[PDB]
Amino acid sequence: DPRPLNDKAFIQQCIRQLCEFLTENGYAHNVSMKSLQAPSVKDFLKIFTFLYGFLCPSYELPDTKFEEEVPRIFKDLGYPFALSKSSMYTVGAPHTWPHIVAALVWLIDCIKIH
């Protein structure tokens, strides 16, 4: 894994990129650096739904089996890094969020092109 996910400054950079993309592109809810430090599973899913909607406009917010569906979508998009069920259940936890925010930023990058 080539990513410096332990570098706290690097993960603030990822969070800032998330904050800026959501803000710039008309996400429905107020977001801040503060509110993106440790999101709930429900807020993560709202964020993920907003982002994946750029690629799949009819995409609906998951809930049932989201811990299966969300990693499956990333896998299907060619994301090379592991997203475990454990991570899905604990997305906002201190040692989980860095991996998840990295995945969202990669998703943002792929939206920004395609």
UniProtKB/Swiss-Prot annotation:
It is found in: Nucleus; Chromosome, Centromere, Kinetochore. It comes from the Eukaryota. Transmembrane segments: none annotated. The modification Phosphoserine is found at residue 84. Phosphorylation begins in S phase of the cell cycle and peaks in mitosis. Phosphorylated by NEK2. Also phosphorylated by AURKA and AURKB. Acts as a component of the essential kinetochore-associated NDC80 complex, which is required for chromosome segregation and spindle checkpoint activity. Required for kinetochore integrity and the organization of stable microtubule binding sites in the outer plate of the kinetochore. The NDC80 complex synergistically enhances the affinity of the SKA1 complex for microtubules and may allow the NDC80 complex to track depolymerizing microtubules. Plays a role in chromosome congression and is essential for the end-on attachment of the kinetochores to spindle microtubules. Component of the NDC80 complex, which consists of NDC80/HEC1, CDCA1, SPBC24 and SPBC25. The NDC80 complex is formed by two subcomplexes composed of NDC80/HEC1-CDCA1 and SPBC24-SPBC25. Each subcomplex is formed by parallel interactions through the coiled-coil domains of individual subunits. Formation of a tetrameric complex is mediated by interactions between the C-terminal regions of both subunits of the NDC80/HEC1-CDCA1 subcomplex and the N-terminal regions of both subunits of the SPBC24-SPBC25 complex. Belongs to the NDC80/HEC1 family. This is Kinetochore protein NDC80 homolog. The lineage of its organism: Eukaryota, Metazoa, Chordata, Craniata, Vertebrata. The gene is NDC80.
